[PDB]
Paper text:
Prevention of pathological clot formation can be achieved by specifically inhibiting the serine proteinase α-thrombin, an enzyme that occupies a central role in the blood coagulation cascade, where it plays both pro and anticoagulant roles. In an attempt to discover new anticoagulants with lower risk of bleeding, a new generation of peptidic DTI derived from the d-Phe-Pro-d-Arg tripeptide scaffold was developed.
Superposition of the heavy chain residues of unliganded α-thrombin with the equivalent residues of the thrombin∶PPACK complex results in a r.m.s.d. of 0.39 Å for 248 aligned Cα atoms. There are also no evident distortions induced by crystal packing.
Residue numbers in the entry:
A (entry chain H): 321 to 466, 475 to 579
B (entry chain L): 291 to 320
Amino acid sequence: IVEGSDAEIGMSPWQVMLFRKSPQELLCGASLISDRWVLTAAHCLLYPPWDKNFTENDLLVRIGKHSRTRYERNIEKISMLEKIYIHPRYNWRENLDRDIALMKLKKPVAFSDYIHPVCLPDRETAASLLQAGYKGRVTGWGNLKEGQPSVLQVVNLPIVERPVCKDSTRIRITDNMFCAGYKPDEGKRGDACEGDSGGPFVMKSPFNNRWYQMGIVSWGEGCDRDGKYGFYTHVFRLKKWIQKVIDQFGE
Amino acid sequence: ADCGLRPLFEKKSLEDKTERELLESYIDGR
Ligand SMILES: *[C@@H]1O[C@H](CO)[C@@H](O)[C@H](O)[C@H]1NC(C)=O
Ligand SMILES: [Cl-]
Ligand code: NA
């Protein structure tokens, strides 16, 4: 996270770290959506141009964390993956369209003060909240500049008008993505950066005071560049697929 | 059923240091 600040303890209890087993390293962010399902970006698991194609036993998730590096014995939970599900129409060859994946854990995780699931938006919540100028929140342990934080970082960023998103890049964007970040004329900064991808873009609903995950950190051209924006997988647009997977393979 | 309500914040009637920025964007952002 560029131009963010340290998270408070328990501020983002749905935050998940996707971790490579061997060698040991932070790969991506992710989020807890129930006691045995975790949401992330497809590109965190599968990106053939870089010979990335993880199997379940290659990875673990760490939940309840604050420190990037310390083993937090009394608060974090480390879980194994039972199965990875990648959207079948994930378009890594062109534009990272439908950049979404689910991971089912080998056993349910116990919730605590530090571990708690985020909500996924319904249609009306998405229609009401995903509007240009309204702000959401991105969290992660990714780099501080395009350089690693000691603890989880947070930044709030405004959703950007689709024509501005489109004009900012030559990538073919789709309705399964949205972009967020400040414009140059707003004179404020902030972005996701390397290591934050797969993590959540959340919004606090004014209707019921609950946090909803509206986006998944997907891609950007550099980090925090003027006239560039972060791109996020549109969670509501993909919710039909999320529901299909969880209904078929079991809550 | 309990999703999105944080044990250390909403459940204790405590606000985090920047969530007001989000709420205020609903007033001023459009
Ligand atoms: C990824 O690896 C799995 C497990 O070996 C393999 O079966 C699958 O074909 C691979 N997928 C791609 C797109 O390379
Ligand atoms: Cl300007
Ligand atoms: Na920018």
